[PDB]
Design a protein around this ligand. Structure first.
Ligand SMILES: CC(=O)SCCNC(=O)CCNC(=O)[C@H](O)C(C)(C)COP(=O)(O)OP(=O)(O)OC[C@H]1O[C@@H](n2cnc3c(N)ncnc32)[C@H](O)[C@@H]1OP(=O)(O)O
Ligand SMILES: CC(=O)SCCNC(=O)CCNC(=O)[C@H](O)C(C)(C)COP(=O)(O)OP(=O)(O)OC[C@H]1O[C@@H](n2cnc3c(N)ncnc32)[C@H](O)[C@@H]1OP(=O)(O)O
Ligand SMILES: Nc1cccc(-c2nnc[nH]2)c1Cl
Lengths: 165, 165
């Protein structure tokens, strides 16, 4: 219930060292449902209404795949979740059975934006990806937040194409 | 060993109906190592040297995750693999615990290109994604093959950003 999703050993010590006083970054755990986690994702897009049972079910699905789904949180001095980020590690046959890190669902509470918390989330996710043996990390962004990813040391590599249902 | 990776029920019947005479599309199976599968991926990028033991190991990893990794093949009239495509289904908390389909590692043998086999692979992967409940399918492409994805009914949705190790 407070068991971290993945090893705290995968949290970048350099990131931990430069966070603001009393803020932390750490793996998700199941009790994060009760520390404002889904409210943070509302800055991204529609989350929907998810009750605790549905959370517990998806959480255990993700925990059964914790060599694939690396979800971490930023907490303020009061233990409130104020930022989220995901790394999803894709297995391939190409690149000698290579692994690609996919950065997803990056979100910082509006009142907490513009203090480098997104940068720290990206640095932490890039640390995980390198540690577990990804050959690269990629993500999709908008023209409007490309400048954020540039300041995180990402470069334009191609186009995102979509098909909706 | 000839057990399909996923249910043949997930292969689009409309696609099967319009393939060229004696060509088929079907799930990967483990014995596809011996029908030229990795040679097809060489059109994409470097595959490396993978022996049968390493193949069997990754195959079983993927088969243990066949609600996530949907790999399918196009076979010619002689049972040779001439095309490949992947759908990887990502689980999210957003969009009411939504699922996004990721189209990956699309490859047609050079001598078999320009006969709609890539189109059929994309149509088949989009069929899988809709069937299992994805809210969208996305992929990354180059400026040079954007025109292919446009003819498959995809639209530009954002930018692919990359960070290498
Ligand atoms: C892959 C994905 O998840 S894309 C989805 C990204 N998420 C969103 O767009 C949701 C809403 N926005 C947010 O949640 C946040 O604003 C984020 C995640 C985009 C950025 O996090 P923040 O903590 O606000 O940014 P942070 O302070 O770390 O930014 C790092 C630097 O980039 C700058 N920056 C932040 N956003 C942008 C932007 N949209 N365009 C240009 N520069 C930006 C910051 O000013 C800062 O600059 P500095 O180094 O000159 O001070
Ligand atoms: C997400 C990813 O995997 S991106 C990686 C894609 N893979 C590669 O680029 C590897 C090398 N190329 C190939 O393997 C193949 O050429 C593919 C997969 C790109 C396309 O498959 P093909 O079977 O050659 O194409 P197919 O005949 O189905 O093409 C459908 C239509 O798009 C056209 N087309 C194909 N490639 C392109 C292109 N690069 N630019 C513009 N139009 C194209 C075809 O002429 C055809 O047009 P029509 O409907 O007017 O006849
Ligand atoms: N492209 C992409 C983006 C986000 C997650 C994934 C994924 N990889 N494994 C499961 N999902 C993939 Cl393939």
């Amino acid at each position: 219930e407070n068991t971290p999703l993945f090893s705290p050993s995968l949290i970048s010590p350099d990131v931990l060292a430069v966070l603001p006083a009393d803020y932390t970054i750490r793996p998700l755990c199941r009790s994060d449902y009760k520390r404002g986690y889904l409210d943070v994702l509302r800055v991204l897009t529609t989350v929907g209404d998810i009750n605790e049972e549905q959370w517990n079910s998806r959480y255990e699905w993700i925990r059964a795949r914790s060599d694939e789904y690396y979800l971490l949180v930023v907490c303020d001095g009061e233990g409130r979740i104020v930022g989220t980020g995901s790394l999803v590690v894709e297995r391939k046959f190409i690149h000698s059975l290579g692994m690609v890190g996919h950065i997803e669902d990056i979100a910082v509470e509006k009142g907490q934006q513009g203090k480098k918390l997104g940068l720290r989330i990206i640095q932490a996710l890039d640390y995980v990806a390198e540690k577990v043996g990804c050959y690269k990390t990629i993500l999709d962004c908008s023209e409007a937040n490309e400048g954020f990813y540039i300041k995180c040391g990402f470069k334009r590599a191609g186009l995102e194409m979509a098909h909706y249902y």
